[PDB]
Amino acid sequence: SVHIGAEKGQIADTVLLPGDPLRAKFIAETYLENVECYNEVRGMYGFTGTYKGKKISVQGTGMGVPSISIYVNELIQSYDVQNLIRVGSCGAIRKDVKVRDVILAMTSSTDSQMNRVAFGSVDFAPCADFELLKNAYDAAKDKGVPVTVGSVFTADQFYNDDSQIEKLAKYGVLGVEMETTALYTLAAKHGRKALSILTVSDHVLTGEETTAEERQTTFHDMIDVALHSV
Amino acid sequence: SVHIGAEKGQIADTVLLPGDPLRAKFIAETYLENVECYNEVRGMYGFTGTYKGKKISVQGTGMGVPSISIYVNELIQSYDVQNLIRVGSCGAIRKDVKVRDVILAMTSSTDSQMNRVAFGSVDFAPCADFELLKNAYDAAKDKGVPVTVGSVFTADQFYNDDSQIEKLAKYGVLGVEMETTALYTLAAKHGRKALSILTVSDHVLTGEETTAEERQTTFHDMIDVALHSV
Amino acid sequence: SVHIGAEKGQIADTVLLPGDPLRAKFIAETYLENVECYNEVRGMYGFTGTYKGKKISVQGTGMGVPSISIYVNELIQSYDVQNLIRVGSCGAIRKDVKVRDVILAMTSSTDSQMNRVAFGSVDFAPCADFELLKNAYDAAKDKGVPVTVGSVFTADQFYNDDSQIEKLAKYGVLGVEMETTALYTLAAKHGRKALSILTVSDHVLTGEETTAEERQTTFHDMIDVALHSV
Amino acid sequence: SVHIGAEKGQIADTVLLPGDPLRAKFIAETYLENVECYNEVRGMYGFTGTYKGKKISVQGTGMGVPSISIYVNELIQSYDVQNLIRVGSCGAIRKDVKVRDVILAMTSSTDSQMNRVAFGSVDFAPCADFELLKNAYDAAKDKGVPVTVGSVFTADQFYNDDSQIEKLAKYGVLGVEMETTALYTLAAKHGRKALSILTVSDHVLTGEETTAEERQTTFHDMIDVALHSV
Amino acid sequence: SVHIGAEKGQIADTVLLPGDPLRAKFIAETYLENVECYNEVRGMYGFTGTYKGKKISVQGTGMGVPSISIYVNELIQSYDVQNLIRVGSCGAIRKDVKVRDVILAMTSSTDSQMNRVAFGSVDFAPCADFELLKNAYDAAKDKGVPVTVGSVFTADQFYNDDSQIEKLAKYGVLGVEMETTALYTLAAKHGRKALSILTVSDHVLTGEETTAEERQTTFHDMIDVALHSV
Amino acid sequence: SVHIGAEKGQIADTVLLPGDPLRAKFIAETYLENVECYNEVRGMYGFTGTYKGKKISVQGTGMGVPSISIYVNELIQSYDVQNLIRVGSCGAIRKDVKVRDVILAMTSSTDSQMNRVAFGSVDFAPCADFELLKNAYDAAKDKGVPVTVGSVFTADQFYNDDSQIEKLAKYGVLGVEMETTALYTLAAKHGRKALSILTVSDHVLTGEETTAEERQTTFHDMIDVALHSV
């Protein structure tokens, strides 16, 4: 596969997709037994290991829709990947979204033209896989993790005129990131199961703000919720 | 309120929204104790009653986004309606969607220009309220009802060139109706809780077909799932 | 026909299309001899009768483009309907449009995405049939009815940000309703003759306002103009 | 006025707008008494004269929306022009449109982005002024001229992929030219009265074809209809 | 060819395209030896002559994209024209663009819907031919002519809400005219070489202004730069 | 700066922007004296060094418009970066583009919605800075490097329906990559100088194909052309 230097099935059915290829490293080392490293292309590191005896892979995606699309496609098409879970952060855009909250995206709004190219006249609303999502909600509530379930906004521009999120907050969108629409759509197209699990990086239209401690907690917190989701 | 001839609070916190104002009649009579009739404007009948002692309202919406939008707005704005559940049918567009299946929409794609007017450059992905949705899933599984959870397609045209649903089936969209986007968006805007619960009316790209018996079953079946959702 | 429970040709060549299925009732009873009732589906009542010995039908459409589209299509395709005249009201948006004025739409602007789906890069300007329209103008001037002839605006949302009509008034658009584009386009597509005849319901950017008396007059007034249009 | 080298009111209330600045010459010389020439800028000749004692002006527009827009704006804004009538030809796109037929545009479809720039989410349907149009119909029928009344298509490209007109013929659009939308819209914006009167230049999806004789007849024929329209 | 009354090859490989058909006259008479006149249709004059012994043609285009498109297409398709250079003016929109400056467009932004019709989801960025452009830059610097090289804006409307150029100046667009996008695109499509060379007509968001003397200089100045470009 | 862990001015006026953060490493080590490493965030390595005594920086961008936008913005806004040159590859889409050819983008088409968000009704054609571009052409021709100068296509999707490039080849677009539009636009907005320099990675609509040797040559070849461009 053009972008991923890996042997067939040297990659798990299940892949966690952080934006950062260095958090990809971190997650493997700090959470998985028997750490393999299949990919080193573009520094976009890929890893495979076990957790509670089960095989789990970890691939960094880079940032923005066009980048994650690249990896999700190859992972799916060239490695028959079955379950793809994003684990990154997002900028909180409501006030009723707390820094501790862990976010499960049912859907996402986007300004990426990825869908309009393919569909034209249709606002295409992408979709988390319920089984994956329910499992994550269950895995959250049993351990008693703070968890919100709603939509996010997959943006093309980190720095924007940003008129959008101010309007999107008014419709109950929870936060902004740059990957989810791309995951959900490509996963749905190819018959796979996708879900996006996200922590708060900071409040964009500040209601409150974040410390290094709060992130370290919610980060770890999110990885668990993901891992136990199967 | 312009379209609904009703006294303040003569309407419940919770309203079931069938497309048909005559199924609206049916549902009241056949499911609710102490049947009031608040609205008779445009034959778009509105009813209030109790079920398991609790107050439940039933308002017909008519067809298409512009029509349901009318009722949802007034119900919300003029009657502080808290929970709005659609109960209609949809044309099944996948083959793995069975005539018995009861459908819970997490989201919907639309070709209505309702959102693009307000948002512009954004594909806005509307969102069912999770609490309502989870409750419906729970109320489904305990009685053991067949139930699928994914997206639908809110269309503007019953008869189309329909090139869309053939493409939308390829992305795992479950079925086509004409209301949901409009519900989810207006509910989200005004801080209310919405959910759309749907039976199969027939298979549009026929995988299988429907009898009068199968509908009568799933219809009733869906009303229960709704009713026990609280 | 899916939505209209009627026997072949039990429906006239000519159909008046009020939004309200109860004004549909009213019009039949109060204007036509030998009243038949072909449709009772969805409470969207359909009627056939005579006037000056000639067969005339009356079908309610519901509200919004997607709804009227449904009836117009079936009426045309399943009942070879030849002449379709809308008789509803509209919100006056200029000041030089008087509450008494009866409106004949040559065309309509819309924000519905119905046309952009089919045409893409084209602003499609729909068209009243001239013969029908001229006949209505003649039938207006002989009795001496106040009558204006220009465009309207077929909206998707009764409640809007409404920035549009303020801009559209500046271009001489007369009023806003929710049906006409849909009529004109479907009528033109299938080789039929359509026309939309409208009274003022109120002034939206208030220049003046309406009583119950003024409506009763213009309503009746409009039905005549329609009826004598053949 | 930047584009028209003319003294205030040296231009009539009424202006005929042929595309060709040389037919502009022709029309003056061959139809009007006391021929003045106000404009010679860009060879886009402008003329003023009398007909049946009444003052009539004649200004060439050039081709395409952006060009006629230029003249229509200045004529309106800088010379308080009251009535603006286009007199050009169009490519017939239906078969039931005959080479002899004289065309009165109620409206026009366009692919020009002129309107979408100003309106955004609105398909804006431009509008002939009825008074002007009725007068032209009357002036046609009394002399007994063949005359059709419907819509046209204002295109941006003489040579196209042209997929549009094949689809637009299916909706009863009569013919294609390159000016009308631009006239109707600018006329409506500034409170003026516009109308577009058109002959057939040839059949684009050939049903029949044209001689030099047939044009000379219909051309002259159209100028009359225009002239007597007041 | 429909719009150009000319015999095969009575037109040069190289054609200068001023907007004004009278500057077309001027340029021929004042710059070329052995002046032929091939076209007189629509007053849109076409000329052929020699300069430094070499054959050079001069065709007026009229104004706006739809008009120049007409001539560029026929010139290319019916006369195998190889090199097409626009020589007109543009409204300067930055302040760092001086009245003396001669402008070489690498590209242009447009609001014309010409490209979106053909491409859909693509912002198509048109392209000057480098060879032509470099040659013009060389021919500029050797004589020592003030010359800027960047983008312009091909507008559909001389009079606009004009919100665009205020935003476009902020991105370094140099000036606004009404032809270039149309040239570059049609030239690129048919394998020909195009370039647009432009003087300042005035400053639109005034930084400074123009005399008749400054234009006469830069005009002549621009024709040279064009002519020596081969 | 959020994404780049660097001290003020520890970054040069001039930055080379390869997609790959590992080619970023390579370029530094193999071309620059006194190698500093300012950034290690996300493995997206940043380096500063000298070449012919002059300070030159090297920052990886990742893939797709949203990603490079991130770095270009911070580099510009937080480090007053003056000159930004992309050095990556592109998929050749014409046949007359040779594997050896080095490509200088004057402009790029895109399907990214980055511009349409900001501009709306405008196809915005981005622009290489001429000074940078000319300098690169000069630095190419003196050493005698094969070099083509035209447009490219900045895509959002590596894997597409790809109907676009087949149409875009027909208009003389040279190749497809995923960064340039984003560079040119952000550079132009902030008053900086940008240029994109690209090798062929392979032929997408295969005319010919590539070896490892041909890339190693053209790669090195391109870095020179960049480096000597100042």
Ligand SMILES: Nc1nc(=O)c2ncn([C@H]3C[C@H](O)[C@@H](CO)O3)c2[nH]1
């Ligand atoms: N736009 C945006 N705003 C935020 O506040 C935010 N917080 C996290 N992210 C995610 C998404 C990207 O992968 C990447 C960009 O830093 O991280 C954000 N994106």
Ligand SMILES: Nc1nc(=O)c2ncn([C@H]3C[C@H](O)[C@@H](CO)O3)c2[nH]1
């Ligand atoms: N488009 C469409 N296709 C179907 O097969 C279908 N089945 C049910 N519905 C819903 C939605 C409307 O409220 C209304 C239109 O009949 O019923 C459908 N809509």
Ligand SMILES: Nc1nc(=O)c2ncn([C@H]3C[C@H](O)[C@@H](CO)O3)c2[nH]1
């Ligand atoms: N938008 C809108 N504004 C008005 O003031 C108005 N007056 C009448 N109508 C028509 C059209 C609908 O069928 C229906 C909505 O009430 O009635 C209106 N629609």
Ligand SMILES: Nc1nc(=O)c2ncn([C@H]3C[C@H](O)[C@@H](CO)O3)c2[nH]1
């Ligand atoms: N597109 C197009 N097709 C035709 O068959 C046709 N016939 C006449 N016209 C009008 C409109 C222009 O002003 C001008 C272009 O020749 O003439 C036409 N335009």
Ligand SMILES: Nc1nc(=O)c2ncn([C@H]3C[C@H](O)[C@@H](CO)O3)c2[nH]1
């Ligand atoms: N829009 C616009 N603004 C100007 O300041 C300007 N200056 C010159 N031009 C060019 C382009 C047309 O061919 C024609 C319109 O007058 O001349 C301009 N166009």
Ligand SMILES: Nc1nc(=O)c2ncn([C@H]3C[C@H](O)[C@@H](CO)O3)c2[nH]1
């Ligand atoms: N779409 C696309 N097709 C190609 O053949 C191609 N060749 C190189 N590139 C550039 C651009 C990306 O940064 C990145 C994606 O691999 O590399 C390409 N992109």
Ligand SMILES: [Cl-]
């Ligand atoms: Cl992330």
Ligand SMILES: [Cl-]
């Ligand atoms: Cl329904």
Ligand SMILES: [Cl-]
């Ligand atoms: Cl109505």
Ligand SMILES: [Cl-]
């Ligand atoms: Cl014409």
Ligand SMILES: [Cl-]
């Ligand atoms: Cl010009």
Ligand SMILES: [Cl-]
């Ligand atoms: Cl690259």
